[PDB]
Amino acid sequence: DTLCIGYHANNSTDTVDTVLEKNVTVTHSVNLLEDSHNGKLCRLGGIAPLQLGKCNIAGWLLGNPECDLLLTVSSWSYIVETSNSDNGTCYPGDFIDYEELREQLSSVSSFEKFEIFPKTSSWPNHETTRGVTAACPYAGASSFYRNLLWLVKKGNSYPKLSKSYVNNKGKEVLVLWGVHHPPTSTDQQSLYQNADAYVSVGSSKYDRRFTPEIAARPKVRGQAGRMNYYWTLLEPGDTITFEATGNLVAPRYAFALNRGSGSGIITSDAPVHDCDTKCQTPHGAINSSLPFQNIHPVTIGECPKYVKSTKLRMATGLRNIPAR
Amino acid sequence: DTLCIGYHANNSTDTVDTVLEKNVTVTHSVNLLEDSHNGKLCRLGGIAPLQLGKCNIAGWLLGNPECDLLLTVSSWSYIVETSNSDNGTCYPGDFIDYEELREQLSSVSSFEKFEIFPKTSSWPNHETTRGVTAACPYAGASSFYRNLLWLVKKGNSYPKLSKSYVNNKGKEVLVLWGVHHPPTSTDQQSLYQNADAYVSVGSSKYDRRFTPEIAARPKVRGQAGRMNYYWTLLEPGDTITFEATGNLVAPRYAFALNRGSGSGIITSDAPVHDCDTKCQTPHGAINSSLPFQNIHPVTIGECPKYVKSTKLRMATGLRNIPAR
Amino acid sequence: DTLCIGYHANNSTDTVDTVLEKNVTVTHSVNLLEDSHNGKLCRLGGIAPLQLGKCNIAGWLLGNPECDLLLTVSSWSYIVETSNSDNGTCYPGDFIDYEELREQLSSVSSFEKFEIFPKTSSWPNHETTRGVTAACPYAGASSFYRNLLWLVKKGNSYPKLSKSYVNNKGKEVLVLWGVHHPPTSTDQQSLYQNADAYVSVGSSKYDRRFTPEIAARPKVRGQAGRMNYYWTLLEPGDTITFEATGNLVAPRYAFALNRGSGSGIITSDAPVHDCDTKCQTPHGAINSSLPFQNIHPVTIGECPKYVKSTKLRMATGLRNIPAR
Amino acid sequence: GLFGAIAGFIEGGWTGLIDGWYGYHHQNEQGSGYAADQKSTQNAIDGITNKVNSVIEKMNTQFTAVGKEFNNLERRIKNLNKKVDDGFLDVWTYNAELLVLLENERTLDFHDSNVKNLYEKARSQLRNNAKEIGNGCFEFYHKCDDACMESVRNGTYDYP
Amino acid sequence: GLFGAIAGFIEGGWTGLIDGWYGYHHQNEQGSGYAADQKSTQNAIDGITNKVNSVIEKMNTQFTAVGKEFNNLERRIKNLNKKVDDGFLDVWTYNAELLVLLENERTLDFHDSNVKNLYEKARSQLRNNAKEIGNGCFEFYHKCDDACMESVRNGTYDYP
Amino acid sequence: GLFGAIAGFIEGGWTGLIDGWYGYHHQNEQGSGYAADQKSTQNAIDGITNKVNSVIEKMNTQFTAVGKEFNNLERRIKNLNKKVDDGFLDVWTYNAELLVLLENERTLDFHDSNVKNLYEKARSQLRNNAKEIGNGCFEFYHKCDDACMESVRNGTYDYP
């Protein structure tokens, strides 16, 4: 009569590495590394993402004519820019602190767009119907930003304008505007009369003065002139005031921002789908409980920690010795 | 006759965690995590901290009328701001590179405050007695910063002023000044005559020119105008020259800085007490030899490393099996 | 008869540390910490490094008179500045975004210097031969930067100049220029006639206007005036346009840049020698396969990981017990 | 093996054992078969499970992490930002791969030790009543039936 | 335990032993009592003290570390700075908790090893002059007085 | 030693053995000498060689890493840049020194484990045909010549 002591063995082909030996076949093990995604841009918390498509943040917030599709959107899980998000400022110029604004939008989950300075009632003494350019076409016709209003002289007169808005929203109000710099003094005159015009903008915190910089610059989109864009976050109950004797590309629509959660902007060329996920990457959604992933360092939601590993498998069982 | 071999065991209730098992009772162990502090702001290097109280750095360096309790302090081991440090720039405006100055104060152990531009003898051709504002009141009456001097025209005249100072202290000298911006052109004349005034400041390294930006900005503390504050560190031997035809809020007192040891500004409501310590945090002082602490990420002096751990105990003895 | 089971032992003096015991002599061990370097600056990928010597990045690119040694160099494996690289901007002023320019150069392995605006043919209506200063002397006589051209009025007339250059090199073109600021308006007029001169620079992306700032500043290198330096990277196919009614220190030589590899600028006083290396530090080159080195944190090429450790040795053999 | 049992003085495993990691064979006159030791197997399962969960506890989940854009005049902070992302990535990748390697080594030793302790346990129970044949088997002197073999498994047996 | 001694074939500890971690009991005809083995206890103490000191050596102290302020147009660098402070915080919290975890496992196995070694030592000393009762005790054949018991403790005894 | 062999019941090494880490002495009537066990020594070398290789793999090389300059109004990003440089530098130094320390412990334990197993292997091979003298030596009863000694080494012997 005999009694032996032994250990388990099976037909597992799972292998793991150890300090003293690589490629050791074991009976049981768990893979800790997730490497699969669905290749789609899904919604998080039931909210669809914002597909900027052919447009980028600048174009979206300014109301570039080519971004009309976005006009009715005001809630999103995350903002998506593609490789072809080239539609921004159709009229050449510098967008001041543009990166900082993008940064600010990363914690904005939704907003309420409102016509801060109505076009048909805010400017009785200035022309409101000639601010178009072939640089910002729409349907082949010269047009302009939907959220800004390019004001020019009225009957050879550009009186000093003064306009104010009191933040009545109970939240932050992103206000955008622009300052146009004509290429020549004659253009300056045909547009605003005042050879020496200026634009002034202020609030309890914001305070800046703008001076037209006349000069012919290498043409971009047919324009030798330039238009610079500015923004600021008007705090609740605070007041923003605009003063100008010319060159003001006045605010038309503004945004009451809603901070909401760690959200953000991603650059992806992956398509959107009627799909839900708790974890989103620029390559597609991850549905996993594993602690690690090597899909992409950029994630949104609750995701496994990004790691550059190709394999992370833990032995749970023992050295498999079928000894067949 | 029998002889056995065994191991120690006591009544210790100490427990530690291991890879394989949690909450294991052991004979002896050592706590490595410090979680106690005296809830007080003590002195370091045998020197008391500078308590700003109702004031913030700005109020202190500029000399906001409400910060007179600090006028006599000139040496400190660290700076303390409270939840109520709102007394800063009583006259609305922008403090340029404010965060940089604060960073610069990090290693300042003390300074030698001196009247760089004696009020009663530096400006024979300008009014030195009307630079007050209801925005910076003292004892109910209109006043101003103690360290700056708001110059205005004398008898309808504001001559081009030119004042220079040679850093003779054998160390850095922090110089602060302001540039005023009236809300209207009539105030600009009432104040400085010259319609097109300017301010120029220069040293071997610093060079900047300021122009008045007239405009009625939303009123803050009653002011529709604005006042910007500037500073620069004058190197040993260098010279600083101020030129102006108006709008200059001239330096009155400046500070010769002495460098001490890595220190800084902390925000805390804890009370200062006659007490000493080698390690200070915003919550209280630490007296420990332990390698870690979960008291506060912010520390001053020599401290255990901050960690987010709840428990860190190493087993020194063995598994406690009293087998009672 | 007897048979015994034992283990090797030798005369090795090697020692290693363990968690439980320090200084344990073992039979065999490997060193993982490289601490040797040849104390010399060698070449990488067979290319010599750029020794700026007495000059620094500014003096080199601008073409400081004391950096003529560098004029012929157009290719390098890395840039070296010494403790005496003090030859930079001989004429006092501010080098705008200087640190950024240096950062840009870190990814430049070579360039092709070309006379963007030929001196004897680009400015027919302006004086091109009086732009020298005693602050930028060469061979005792006052001189100027080899790459910029200080233009001044020609026979009491500084007409509005306008000069354009179309980047046509197929790569980024580094363009440098300056704006001069006279100490007095009397100088402003002797140099450029126009009292209200201006300089305008524009491309598809760049757009900036400069205004003279006249004022007597503390003299530096005998100059009470200031000269500010600027640069920009003209993209392939883009155009850069200069407009000026005075004060412009014009581009003469520009650089078509070739991005290369991770390279950089180092500060070292180690000598340059006919030598090669895959790994280079400011103290000397390294020739090693070890994973770690404690020579220097800064390295160029393929080097062992920097570490502050004094000793890193793994026991491979066993505790040595010669029991002699 | 660090304890000489697994792949040691007990050359191979039993595909035949199928209800645990460690068990017995037994070739009693009544028949043959396999029976896994619960005590051992469950204790091991509790520890390895706790080991895996510990590894996972330590590793932090990743929430929303998105890039920042920089203009053409902010290359230094842009490179700094990248040095920070690359730095932590290299560190965490190192931490994750190293911890898994080290634990995998521990884990295999843990099993080896468990087998060894089981052998020595069954060995100190039998004593003179059986001889060590090697390969982890014990040949009885007094013949042991199923009723008896079971006493050895549940550590009762007893008979110096 | 990894070596089967502690909480193993020696089921428990002696609240009685009070002059060391590892020791002897002995119930000689003259009497009974407890005597801790110095050799082992001290060696183990030196090792553990060295381990504790080493852990503390690697962990760097923390000097002055305060916060930095940023304006409303520096949200990007502010976030960069926070990403840096949080990153290192998580890394060190990780290292600290993990080092303690792993060493605690090592420590208990160290003690387990020591007891085991002590037993095999006292065992190879007796050989035929006593029998292994299990539970770590040895019963002498030739009877052993206090003067003889001590010889076992200080590894003298000798008598194949 | 964690396993009691090296610096344990086998007090010292043999400067004599010179063809391996683990060997036999043998003092047969025909003569004396030393012979290293290949099976053991080579397994140990492969393992330790993999250990060193694994350690080196994990440690990432370091390419071009050059400093940055900051003007006098960028003390915050400069310090941020330094806090990142010292931060990663401290972390890797800790990782380097700590991995080495722990692996050194494990390495010696490995050898100790190997010696012990070799002993126990030669031991279960002889059984009755010799007695345990201690110090790791076995004294044959039936006398063992060179042709016999070699049978023990290559694990053939066999003779209950």
Ligand SMILES: CC(=O)N[C@H]1[C@H](O[C@H]2[C@@H](O)[C@@H](CO)O[C@@H](O[C@H]3[C@H](O)[C@@H](O)[C@H](O)O[C@@H]3CO)[C@@H]2O)O[C@H](CO)[C@@H](O[C@@H]2O[C@H](CO[C@]3(C(=O)O)C[C@H](O)[C@@H](NC(C)=O)[C@H]([C@H](O)[C@H](O)CO)O3)[C@H](O)[C@H](O)[C@H]2O)[C@@H]1O
């Ligand atoms: C500079 C000043 O005092 N501005 C006042 C302004 O005063 C005008 C008033 O005295 C009329 C009366 O005839 O005369 C003006 O004009 C002369 C003109 O320039 C000249 O060319 C011509 O030949 O003769 C005329 C007649 O002399 C004066 O400019 O009045 C308004 C209405 O009350 C003031 O506005 C309100 O001001 C409040 C703040 O007042 C203070 C303050 O801080 O408390 C008073 C301080 O004394 C003053 N500091 C000085 C001079 O150093 C400051 C300072 O002017 C501001 O900070 C500048 O921005 O003001 C508060 O702002 C309230 O909300 C306003 O409605 C205006 O300040």
Ligand SMILES: CC(=O)N[C@@H]1[C@@H](O)[C@H](O)[C@@H](CO)O[C@@H]1O
């Ligand atoms: C208003 C506007 O931006 N229109 C342009 C369009 O003319 C151009 O063809 C396209 C190319 O990407 O970009 C933008 O859509």
Ligand SMILES: CC(=O)N[C@@H]1[C@@H](O)[C@H](O)[C@@H](CO)O[C@@H]1O
């Ligand atoms: C000059 C000045 O700053 N005074 C104000 C004071 O009027 C106000 O009541 C207090 C409230 O925080 O702040 C400051 O002390």
Ligand SMILES: CC(=O)N[C@@H]1[C@@H](O)[C@H](O)[C@@H](CO)O[C@@H]1O
């Ligand atoms: C044009 C120029 O730069 N000349 C100066 C030279 O006069 C001075 O002696 C030297 C000191 O480092 O610096 C520069 O070379």
